[PDB]
Amino acid sequence: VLSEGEWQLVLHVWAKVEADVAGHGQDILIRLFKSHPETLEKFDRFKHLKTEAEMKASEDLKKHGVTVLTALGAILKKKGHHEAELKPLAQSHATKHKIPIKYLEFISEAIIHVLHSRHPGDFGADAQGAMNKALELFRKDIAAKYKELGYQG
Numbered sequence: 001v002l003s004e005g006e007w008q009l010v011l012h013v014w015a016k017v018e019a020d021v022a023g024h025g026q027d028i029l030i031r032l033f034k035s036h037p038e039t040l041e042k043f044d045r046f047k048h049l050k051t052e053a054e055m056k057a058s059e060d061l062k063k064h065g066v067t068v069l070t071a072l073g074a075i076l077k078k079k080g081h082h083e084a085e086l087k088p089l090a091q092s093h094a095t096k097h098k099i100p101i102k103y104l105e106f107i108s109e110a111i112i113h114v115l116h117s118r119h120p121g122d123f124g125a126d127a128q129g130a131m132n133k134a135l136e137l138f139r140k141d142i143a144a145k146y147k148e149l150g151y152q153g
């Protein structure tokens with residue numbers, strides 16, 4: 001359970017992201033794919049991209065980064081009361097896209113890295129700890145839905 005103070009830190013940086021959702025989304029997906037190439041393999045849409053320049057040039061990858069960050073922002077702004085938003089996302093990522101929980105750990109690390117690079121004055125250690133807690137709560141709650149469906153592994 002995050003405290004109200006921890007939520008405020010999370011959402012303060014997140015309001016900065018919403019100024020350039022697409023730039024952040026590209027940076028986070030590129031970092032994920034470069035740091036963890038097995039993740040790129042889950043996207044039939046992107047598996048043709050072989051270089052970071054090709055990734056940066058893909059308008060389709062930038063569109064998907066916006067999709068991802070708009071869904072995460074709606075979850076964060078629920079401050080934990082996110083069951084309605086998480087259900088469909090867990091269901092599709094477990095049963096259709098076949099994404100292990102560990103790859104949600106990986107994208108969480110990429111989000112934290114990109115927020116530190118782009119917003120260092122609003123992402124000191126207090127805010128990095130709070131965002132880590134928020135992303136752990138997201139993963140916890142997705143993992144419980146995976147387990148229900150038989151995909152916690």
Ligand code: HEM
Pocket residue numbers: 039040042043044045067068069071072088089092093097099103104107
């Ligand atoms: C913060 C974490 C994430 C969020 C909020 C998120 C959100 C979304 C949303 C909103 C969609 C489209 C609707 C849907 O299919 O449910 C989507 C699609 C998809 N996601 Fe995620 N996602 C996350 C992480 C990941 C990770 C880590 C992977 C792979 C490693 C992944 C793989 C995919 C795939 C393969 C699709 C379908 C893309 C396509 O072919 O159109 N997601 N995601």
